[PDB]
Design an enzyme around this catalytic site. Structure first.
Site, PDB file in Angstrom:
ATOM      1  N   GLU A  35       0.790  -1.212   0.000  1.00 51.39           N
ATOM      2  CA  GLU A  35       0.000   0.000   0.000  1.00 51.39           C
ATOM      3  C   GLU A  35       0.845   1.297   0.000  1.00 51.39           C
ATOM      4  OE1 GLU A  35      -3.027   0.161  -0.586  1.00 51.39           O
ATOM      5  OE2 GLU A  35      -3.862  -1.809  -0.072  1.00 51.39           O
ATOM      6  N   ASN A  46      -7.467   8.586  -6.194  1.00 55.73           N
ATOM      7  CA  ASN A  46      -8.251   7.507  -6.837  1.00 55.73           C
ATOM      8  C   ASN A  46      -8.997   8.128  -7.998  1.00 55.73           C
ATOM      9  OD1 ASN A  46      -7.568   5.521  -4.877  1.00 55.73           O
ATOM     10  ND2 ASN A  46      -9.000   6.414  -3.388  1.00 55.73           N
ATOM     11  N   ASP A  48     -12.036   7.995  -8.741  1.00 54.26           N
ATOM     12  CA  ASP A  48     -13.266   8.613  -8.286  1.00 54.26           C
ATOM     13  C   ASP A  48     -13.115   9.938  -7.548  1.00 54.26           C
ATOM     14  OD1 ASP A  48     -12.426   7.877  -5.685  1.00 54.26           O
ATOM     15  OD2 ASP A  48     -14.079   6.497  -5.396  1.00 54.26           O
ATOM     16  N   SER A  50     -11.693  10.425  -4.658  1.00 52.06           N
ATOM     17  CA  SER A  50     -11.205  10.119  -3.327  1.00 52.06           C
ATOM     18  C   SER A  50      -9.648  10.041  -3.338  1.00 52.06           C
ATOM     19  CB  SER A  50     -11.834   8.857  -2.765  1.00 52.06           C
ATOM     20  OG  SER A  50     -11.360   7.668  -3.402  1.00 52.06           O
ATOM     21  N   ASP A  52      -6.326   8.123  -0.961  1.00 51.80           N
ATOM     22  CA  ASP A  52      -5.876   7.192   0.030  1.00 51.80           C
ATOM     23  C   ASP A  52      -4.700   7.764   0.803  1.00 51.80           C
ATOM     24  OD1 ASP A  52      -7.761   5.464  -1.082  1.00 51.80           O
ATOM     25  OD2 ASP A  52      -6.177   4.199  -1.965  1.00 51.80           O
ATOM     26  N   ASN A  59      -9.025   5.310   2.665  1.00 51.80           N
ATOM     27  CA  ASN A  59      -9.694   6.046   1.592  1.00 51.80           C
ATOM     28  C   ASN A  59     -10.629   7.098   2.203  1.00 51.80           C
ATOM     29  OD1 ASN A  59     -10.838   6.724  -0.907  1.00 51.80           O
ATOM     30  ND2 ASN A  59     -11.293   4.664  -1.546  1.00 51.80           N
ATOM     31  N   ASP A 101     -15.596  -4.464   9.420  1.00 46.06           N
ATOM     32  CA  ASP A 101     -16.883  -4.139   8.814  1.00 46.06           C
ATOM     33  C   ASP A 101     -17.485  -5.174   7.873  1.00 46.06           C
ATOM     34  OD1 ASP A 101     -15.519  -3.422   6.358  1.00 46.06           O
ATOM     35  OD2 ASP A 101     -17.169  -2.017   5.988  1.00 46.06           O
TER      36      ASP A 101
END
Ligand SMILES: [Cl-]
Ligand SMILES: [Cl-]
Ligand code: NA
Ligand SMILES: [Ru+3]
Length: 129
Positions: A35, A46, A48, A50, A52, A59, A101
């Site tokens: 990562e 990202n 979209d 967003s 990280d 994110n 989650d």
């Protein structure tokens, strides 16, 4: 801060990741390797819109507030900049929520594609823990 492999393994254990939700420490280290290359200051945009952040590339779509991710949530209740600190507390605390989650560490696509099913124990091999 760019952590050492064993230095991070130790930091992670101290902060409660070793076997958190059944994921051995090597899983966490291998995920951090791919990562962020162990760099707390890693950011990547990202497609979209967003971003990280940090050692486990958390994110802004779901997990932290960076003020420029339209329609997003801040489920860990922190500014995304807290995830860049040489102190990994906010990264670890937020990762515990993410891994809890439902999809486990599959949340981290580099974990799924690069760590999952491998000899992750090699990532902690040699380290004083
Ligand atoms: Cl935002
Ligand atoms: Cl799981
Ligand atoms: Na956000
Ligand atoms: Ru082995």
């Amino acid at each position: 801060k760019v952590f050492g492999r064993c230095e991070l393994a130790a930091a992670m254990k101290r902060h409660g990741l070793d076997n958190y939700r059944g994921y051995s420490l090597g899983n966490w280290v291998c995920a951090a390797k791919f990562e962020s290359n162990f760099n707390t200051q890693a950011t990547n945009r990202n497609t979209d819109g967003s971003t990280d952040y940090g050692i486990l590339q958390i994110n802004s779509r779901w997990w932290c507030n960076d003020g420029r991710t339209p329609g997003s949530r801040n489920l860990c209740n922190i500014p995304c900049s807290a995830l860049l600190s040489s102190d990994i507390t906010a990264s670890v605390n937020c990762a515990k929520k993410i891994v809890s989650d439902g999809n486990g560490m599959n949340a981290w696509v580099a974990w799924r594609n690069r760590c999952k099913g491998t000899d992750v124990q090699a990532w902690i091999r040699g380290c004083r823990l």
